[PDB]
Amino acid sequence: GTENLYFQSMDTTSKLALILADADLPAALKAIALKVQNQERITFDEGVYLYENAELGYLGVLANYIREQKHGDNTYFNRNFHIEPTNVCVYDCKFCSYSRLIKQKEEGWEMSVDGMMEVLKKYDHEPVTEVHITGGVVPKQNLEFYSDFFRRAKAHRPELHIKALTPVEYYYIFKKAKLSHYDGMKYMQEAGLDSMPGGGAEIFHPEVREKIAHDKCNAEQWLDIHEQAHKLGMKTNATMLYGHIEQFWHRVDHMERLRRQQDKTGGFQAFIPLKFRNQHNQMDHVPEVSVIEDLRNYAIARIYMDNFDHIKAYWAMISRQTAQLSLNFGVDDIDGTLDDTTKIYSPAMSTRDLVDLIKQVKRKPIERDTLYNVVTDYSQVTF
Amino acid sequence: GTENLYFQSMDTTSKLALILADADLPAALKAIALKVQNQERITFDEGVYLYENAELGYLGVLANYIREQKHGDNTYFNRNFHIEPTNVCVYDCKFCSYSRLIGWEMSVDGMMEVLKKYDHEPVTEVHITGGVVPKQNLEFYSDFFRRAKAHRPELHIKALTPVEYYYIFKKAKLSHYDGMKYMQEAGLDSMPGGGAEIFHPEVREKIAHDKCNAEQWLDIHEQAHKLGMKTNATMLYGHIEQFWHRVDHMERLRRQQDKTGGFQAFIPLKFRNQHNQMDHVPEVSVIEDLRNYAIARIYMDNFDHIKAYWAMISRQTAQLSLNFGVDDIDGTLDDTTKIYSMPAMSTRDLVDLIKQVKRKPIERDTLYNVVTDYSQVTF
Numbered sequence: 033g034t035e036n037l038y039f040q041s042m043d044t045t046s047k048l049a050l051i052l053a054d055a056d057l058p059a060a061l062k063a064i065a066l067k068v069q070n071q072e073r074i075t076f077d078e079g080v081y082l083y084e085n086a087e088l089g090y091l092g093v094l095a096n097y098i099r100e101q102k103h104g105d106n107t108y109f110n111r112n113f114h115i116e117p118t119n120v121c122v123y124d125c126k127f128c129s130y131s132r133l134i135k136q137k138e139e140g141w142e143m144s145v146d147g148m149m150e151v152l153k154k155y156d157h158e159p160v161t162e163v164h165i166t167g168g169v170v171p172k173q174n175l176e177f178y179s180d181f182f183r184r185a186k187a188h189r190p191e192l193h194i195k196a197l198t199p200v201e202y203y204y205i206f207k208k209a210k211l212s213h214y215d216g217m218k219y220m221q222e223a224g225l226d227s228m229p230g231g232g233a234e235i236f237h238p239e240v241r242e243k244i245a246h247d248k249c250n251a252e253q254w255l256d257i258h259e260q261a262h263k264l265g266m267k268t269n270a271t272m273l274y275g276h277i278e279q280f281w282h283r284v285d286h287m288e289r290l291r292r293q294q295d296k297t298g299g300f301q302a303f304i305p306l307k308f309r310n311q312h313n314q315m316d317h318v319p320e321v322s323v324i325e326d327l328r329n330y331a332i333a334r335i336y337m338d339n340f341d342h343i344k345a346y347w348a349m350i351s352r353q354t355a356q357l358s359l360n361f362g363v364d365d366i367d368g369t370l371d372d373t374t375k376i377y378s379p380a381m382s383t384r385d386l387v388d389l390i391k392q393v394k395r396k397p398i399e400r401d402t403l404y405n406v407v408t409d410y411s412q413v414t415f
Numbered sequence: 416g417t418e419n420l421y422f423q424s425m426d427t428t429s430k431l432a433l434i435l436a437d438a439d440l441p442a443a444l445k446a447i448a449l450k451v452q453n454q455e456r457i458t459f460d461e462g463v464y465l466y467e468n469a470e471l472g473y474l475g476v477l478a479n480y481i482r483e484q485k486h487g488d489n490t491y492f493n494r495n496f497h498i499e500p501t502n503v504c505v506y507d508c509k510f511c512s513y514s515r516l517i518g519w520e521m522s523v524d525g526m527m528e529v530l531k532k533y534d535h536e537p538v539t540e541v542h543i544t545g546g547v548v549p550k551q552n553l554e555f556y557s558d559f560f561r562r563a564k565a566h567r568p569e570l571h572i573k574a575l576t577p578v579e580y581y582y583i584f585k586k587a588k589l590s591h592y593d594g595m596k597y598m599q600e601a602g603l604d605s606m607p608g609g610g611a612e613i614f615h616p617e618v619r620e621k622i623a624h625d626k627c628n629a630e631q632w633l634d635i636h637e638q639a640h641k642l643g644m645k646t647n648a649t650m651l652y653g654h655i656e657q658f659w660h661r662v663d664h665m666e667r668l669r670r671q672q673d674k675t676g677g678f679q680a681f682i683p684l685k686f687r688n689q690h691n692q693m694d695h696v697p698e699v700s701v702i703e704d705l706r707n708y709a710i711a712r713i714y715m716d717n718f719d720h721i722k723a724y725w726a727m728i729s730r731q732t733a734q735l736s737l738n739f740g741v742d743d744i745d746g747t748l749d750d751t752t753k754i755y756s757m758p759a760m761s762t763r764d765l766v767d768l769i770k771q772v773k774r775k776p777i778e779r780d781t782l783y784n785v786v787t788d789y790s791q792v793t794f
């Protein structure tokens with residue numbers, strides 16, 4: 033007929049009404065669709081039910097309804113850069129190339145505070161607004177190391193926002209320094225820490241965590257360090273590593289613990305699915321999941337995580353097509369390090385490239401501030 | 416895969432670029448898609464090639480690109496009413512229930528009594544069409560136009576086709592130019608698009624044997640255009656004609672528009688086999704209706720508007736047509752509340768139909784300027 037074409041042509045609100053009026057839709061899926069229409073929270077069991085039963089089309093109707101209700105077409109990005117203090121690590125995560133079981137200390141490097149400051153100064157005449165600091169955990173890079181770096185960075189470039197380190201790092205540094213998590217985070221904030229990134233969550237459930245990330249900080253510890261950051265007024269993000277050896281209920285359990293923490297302390301801005309990759313780690317024969325599973329996962333994340341403003345995708349972590357399609361399955365925040373530089377003396381994402389990627393799937397490219405206000409609306413900007 | 420989903424998700428410009436970069440698309444279809452990207456006219460044989468070869472998806476990419484280039488999301492409708500002077504006719508069209516080979520007649524007083532029923536309605540146009548009969552002659556219609564303009568000067572009169580004008584001017588011994596000039600002076604403002612059927616003699620001699628021919632139809636529009644009148648054009652499709660007859664029809668309109676420029680809208684009219692002498696001719700599919708809208712948009716590069724009547728076709732078809740080249744949706748709006756009561760399209764119903772396919776409902780006036788932009792209204 034033209035039935036599929038007509039459904040595809042409907043506005044977001046009409047699509048959800050059409051699903052709710054479909055006599056053939058199983059009752060479980062109608063009840064969940066009705067919750068979404070009413071901005072009601074879905075349960076753990078409903079989350080599992082979506083992962084086990086829901087088709088991509090259905091999930092896109094719900095997730096996109098939420099994404100447009102919260103953000104309209106806005107698709108946010110900012111101008112950041114990275115410093116990696118070390119590319120080796122004391123811990124043994126089976127999905128990570130820096131695991132002490134696959135990479136000896138001699139096969140990598142550990143920056144000094146001087147070296148980190150030399151990297152930071154390369155960006156002095158760049159319109160970056162924040163630096164992201166993440167990497168391995170090593171004994172020389174302790175409380176004094178990081179606090180000295182934050183103080184030197186703020187002395188040199190006061191206006192540069194520092195988004196640095198995960199609870200995996202903070203648990204290790206605060207245990208050795210004999211500070212409580214609160215007093216440790218307070219000390220780092222005073223030194224110049226502004227916010228935290230979302231890494232190190234992996235999967236919370238011990239059934240999975242004991243297998244893939246057995247020796248670094250546990251879920252209670254990870255959530256506790258975010259709780260203390262939130263009590264100090266800091267913003268943070270949260271991740272979930274998916275599509276490896278976990279079961280769908282392990283994903284919903286993960287998201288449930290995050291959702292309860294957000295209801296307690298309110299400090300998370302973005303939820304960030306991280307797709308497992310089977311290259312250069314101890315999990316080389318674990319198959320990666322399909323683009324369809326990536327998109328069902330973004331959608332279910334959008335539906336489940338009702339108290340997180342943003343769902344973030346990293347353009348360098350997924351294909352161009354997956355990143356663009358994700359903007360229709362719940363994603364409103366697209367991230368990575370923008371690179372307008374030209375190689376001299378001879379795959380970067382320029383601002384023009386990213387703006388065109390976003391406009392190609394009918395979305396509105398927004399350069400944001402740290403609280404997701406509009407700094408530049410690129411929608412009618414021509415280059 | 417997500418290949419189909421990815422294509423469906425692209426903006427208008429990017430979907431056209433995606434077709435042009437498709438290695439498996441036939442060369443001939445890539446060449447036409449490139450002409451559309453370059454705003455280059457497609458030729459008669461390219462038009463026939465699209466009817467004979469092109470798939471709906473492809474044709475939606477090209478037609479929607481043109482439609483959005485010209486109009487963006489604008490979807491136009493006006494506020495009009497109809498008078499039907501007679502449902503009897505002297506002619507023999509095999510697709511028409513009024514054919515003499517298978518009734519009432521209004522007086523000028525009767526037509527004026529109908530017009531006066533709309534005195535308190537904000538209608539911008541009256542549309543007048545129907546059968547051709549000898550009592551409804553030049554003198555009859557000029558009397559009506561003068562009475563209508565005297566009663567309601569700002570009511571635009573969009574009245575009668577060349578089928579009617581050819582008959583009344585031949586009887587009055589006026590040239591087409593002098594007759595249209597006379598009717599304009601009496602109060603005619605514009606002509607609707609009917610009576611075009613299919614121009615090619617191979618088809619027209621069979622389906623509309625007695626009424627004016629293509630030359631006479633085009634000439635009466637030409638005289639209208641020279642007098643500053645805007646007019647529309649139709650094409651009756653989906654009956655016994657071949658696709659090349661449709662392209663021939665469009666080509667004659669396209670050439671006439673290049674010459675005189677007075678056409679505003681091109682209006683495909685779907686053949687129906689109910690209550691006529693073509694009652695065994697099979698009707699074409701909704702997909703063929705949408706391919707036909709799309710090819711009309713691509714071919715008719717010098718027509719501003721492609722129009723669908725919401726009543727001619729399903730709700731669903733009219734909505735889909737807005738994505739296959741249609742910018743202009745027509746019919747008689749009815750916002751009246753029935754009092755003393757024991758289907759009709761309201762403005763609200765039409766606005767909801769347009770917004771449901773992500774388009775901008777513009778209630779427009781005779782100059783295609785805004786009366787109300789319903790994209791800025793919440794009911």
Ligand code: SF4
Pocket residue numbers: 120121122123124125128129130131132167168169200248
């Ligand atoms: S703790 Fe972080 S860097 Fe170290 S092995 Fe695990 S994931 Fe890699």
Ligand code: SF4
Pocket residue numbers: 504505506507508511512513514515545546547578626
């Ligand atoms: S001239 Fe018009 S009204 Fe008369 S039979 Fe033909 S189509 Fe019908």
